[PDB]
Amino acid sequence: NKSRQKELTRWLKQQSVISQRWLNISRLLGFVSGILIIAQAWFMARILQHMIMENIPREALLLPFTLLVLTFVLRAWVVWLRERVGYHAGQHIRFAIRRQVLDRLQQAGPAWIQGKPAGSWATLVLEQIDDMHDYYARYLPQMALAVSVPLLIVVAIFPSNWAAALILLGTAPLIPLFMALVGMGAADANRRNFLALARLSGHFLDRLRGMETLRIFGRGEAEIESIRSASEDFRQRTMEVLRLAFLSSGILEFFTSLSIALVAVYFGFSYLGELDFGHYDTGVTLAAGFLALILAPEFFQPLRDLGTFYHAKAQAVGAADSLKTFMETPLAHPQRGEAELASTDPVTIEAEELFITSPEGKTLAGPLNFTLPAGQRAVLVGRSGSGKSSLLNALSGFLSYQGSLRINGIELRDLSPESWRKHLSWVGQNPQLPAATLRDNVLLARPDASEQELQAALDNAWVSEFLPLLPQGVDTPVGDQAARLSVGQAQRVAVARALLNPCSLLLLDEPAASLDAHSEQRVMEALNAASLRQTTLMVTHQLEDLADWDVIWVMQDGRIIEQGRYAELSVAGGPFATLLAHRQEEI
């Protein structure tokens, strides 16, 4: 009831209502499978009795053989239909869960997305959502088939011989009785074995990622023993659980073997005259005996096939564990207003008692009390981890805040994000080029731009000086994660994208941090000029060239601890002078 295995299994069925139409069709077609199985067994039992007992030649039995062939062809048709319907049930659930996951992930914003590597979000969205398919496509339909076919077998056998129907029905309550004893606790113990297996896989991946450290210390040979010990420890731990978990397989194989033997023994001795019960005082026939024998392995087959689907369920429960907690983590979600910024002129950012909050509730920047007049450029400086980058994300709308942050006297909470972000241009380190071609990436800011405007942007950002080096020129595919372009020229494309449309506010988050010596000289040259056209807020540790910037904010531990122009701060001996001296120690 309260186990994590049952909690995750309830979650999986809560998502299955997306395709309840498909699961009802599949359950209805499984009921047709049961009827065709019985019609199969009834025709074979009649043909067998005629040839074995009444010695009717096979040339006189074309009607039963013909009907037997149709019920075989119909069975293959229903198996074809159920397999196709089963896929549709899985597909429309995965499509809906993926939409919810991407909705929750777009709406949480880049503040939460960058908390994890993008390959771990791809595991959640691709691998783990797809690990749930076979549970909906195969396992859940097989559960329905395991309680419809066996009861329909019993209903078919019961009129012919109630003793034979009792042999099958007698074993029915014992299998769930085993579930109470073992297999309810073993199922959750197995769920932890699959977690330990995934953790053992991350133990091996950890040793692979650290082979460079293992090499320099000469620990490679002693790390084979750690791989062997961890694997040996996993196997012994898992095999203790499986010695109990595999008892379901054997017990189901025992009760299917006992039922076939009991049906054979009961009918066989009834023919010999030893027994005289169960046949409704009419007489036991070979057709009645064959009908129960053909349908005795069919009574247990849906349950035996359900153990063939154990791993479909086990990997969906493992996937549901990651997807249930993802969908349930509370998130900050900065609230969006309806107000719009009327003018297109540079804004006047004002903040008082402003606290910036991470999507998880953590406070990233303490009390901020700055003021930035229109058209003025300011710089954030400070030690890494002091919350400089968090202030730029609050202004972008990516972070919620407790305080005041007024753009033109209007709180940033009340500004509609769509209208506010059309007055916003941003260049950061680690440029992202989502589009396909280099012309599409630059023109992403506004596709309606004219060719004359585009060429001006490609010239001011110095993109055109490396276009000849590119194979196709401006219409060059950029590649996966800008593989064609080096980081120096990818960042210049981001600069071209930013200055394609002059705006009200320009946010720069260390634009030239890791660029080469040349692109840095051209990225800054373009941004030095751009910063004069509108209100600019830049984050740097390149303190040696801040003379022309009219405001400098020194941020430490989430608050502004110093202010003023470069001339005053460089000689005041405050925290900026310490940072400037530390910066000058670089070559």
Partner 1 sequence: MRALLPYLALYKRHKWMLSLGIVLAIVTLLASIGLLTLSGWFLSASAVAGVAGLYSFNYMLPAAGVRGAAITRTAGRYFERLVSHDATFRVLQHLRIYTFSKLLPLSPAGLAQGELLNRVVADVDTLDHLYLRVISPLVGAFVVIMVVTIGLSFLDFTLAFTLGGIMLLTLFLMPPLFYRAGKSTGQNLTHLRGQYRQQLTAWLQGQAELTIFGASDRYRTQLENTEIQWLEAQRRQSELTALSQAIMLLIGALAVILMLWMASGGVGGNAQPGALIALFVFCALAAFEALAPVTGAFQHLGQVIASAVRISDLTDQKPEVTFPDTQTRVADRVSLTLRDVQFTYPEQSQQALKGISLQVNAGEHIAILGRTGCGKSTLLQQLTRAWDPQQGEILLNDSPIASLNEAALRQTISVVPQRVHLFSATLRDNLLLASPGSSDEALSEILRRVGLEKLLEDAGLNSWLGEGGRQLSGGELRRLAIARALLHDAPLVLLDEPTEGLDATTESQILELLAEMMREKTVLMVTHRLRGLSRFQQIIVMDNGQIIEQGTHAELLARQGRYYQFKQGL
Q: What does the DSSP 8-state code read for residue 433?
A: -
Q: Which of residues 469-498 bind partner 1 (CB under 8 A)?
A: 480-481, 494, 497
Q: Which of 32, 143, 147, 251 binds partner 1 (CB under 8 A)?
A: 251
What does the block give as tokens for 2? 């309260």
Q: What does the DSSP 8-state code read for residue 285?
A: -
Q: 476 phi and psi, to 5 degrees?
A: -95, 130
Whether the Cβ atoms of residue 178 and residue 156 lie closer than 8 Å to each other: no
Non-local (6+) Cβ contacts of 575 within 8 A are: 382, 554, 556, 561, 562
Give me the residues that bind ligand HEB (CB under 6 A), please. 190, 193-194, 197, 238, 241-242, 245, 248-249, 307-308, 310-311
Torsion angle of alpha carbons 40, 43, 47, 52, nearest 10°? 70
Q: Which is nearer to partner 1, 28 or 76 (CB)?
A: 76
Q: Which of residues 532-561 bind partner 1 (CB under 8 A)?
A: 544
Q: How far is the CB of 37 from partner 1 (least distance, A)?
A: 11
Cα gap 554→551, rounded to integer Å: 10
Cα gap 183→307, rounded to integer Å: 12
- Annotation: binding site for ATP: 372-379
Q: Which of 14, 20, 24, 213 binds partner 1 (CB under 8 A)?
A: 213
CA 50 to chain centre: 60
Q: How far is the CB of 502 from partner 1 (least distance, A)?
A: 14
Cα gap 399→389, rounded to integer Å: 11
Q: Which is nearer to ligand HEB, 92 or 192 (CB)?
A: 192
Query: Does residue number 76 form part of the binding site for partner 1 (CB under 8 A)?
Result: yes
Query: Does residue number 573 form part of the binding site for partner 1 (CB under 8 A)?
Result: no
Query: Does residue number 444 form part of the binding site for partner 1 (CB under 8 A)?
Result: yes
Q: Which is nearer to ligand HEB, 127 or 516 (CB)?
A: 127
Angle (deg, nearest 10), helices 517-530 and 451-460: 120
**Residue 503 three-state SS:** coil
Q: Which of 1, 176, 177, 218 binds partner 1 (CB under 8 A)?
A: 218
Cα gap 508→498, rounded to integer Å: 10
Q: Which of 25, 39, 156, 263 binds partner 1 (CB under 8 A)?
A: 263
The label of the residue with tokens 């063939």 reads 308
Taking CB within 5 to 8 Å according to partner kind, which of ligand HEB, partner 1, none is near residue 193? ligand HEB
Query: Does residue number 333 form part of the binding site for partner 1 (CB under 8 A)?
Result: no
Query: Does residue number 453 form part of the binding site for partner 1 (CB under 8 A)?
Result: no
**Pairing, β 400-406 against β 349-357:** antiparallel
Q: How far is the CB of 205 from ligand HEB (least distance, A)?
A: 15
- Find the residue with minimal CB distance to ligand HEB: 307
The label of the residue with tokens 């009649």 reads 46
Q: How far is the CB of 201 from partner 1 (least distance, A)?
A: 6
Q: Which is nearer to partner 1, 541 or 565 (CB)?
A: 541
Q: How far is the CB of 312 from ligand HEB (least distance, A)?
A: 8
What does the block give as tokens for 247? 């008892």
Which one of 93-101, 175-183, 321-329, 399-407 is the stretch in contact with partner 1 (CB under 8 A)? Answer: 93-101
Query: Does residue number 102 form part of the binding site for partner 1 (CB under 8 A)?
Result: yes
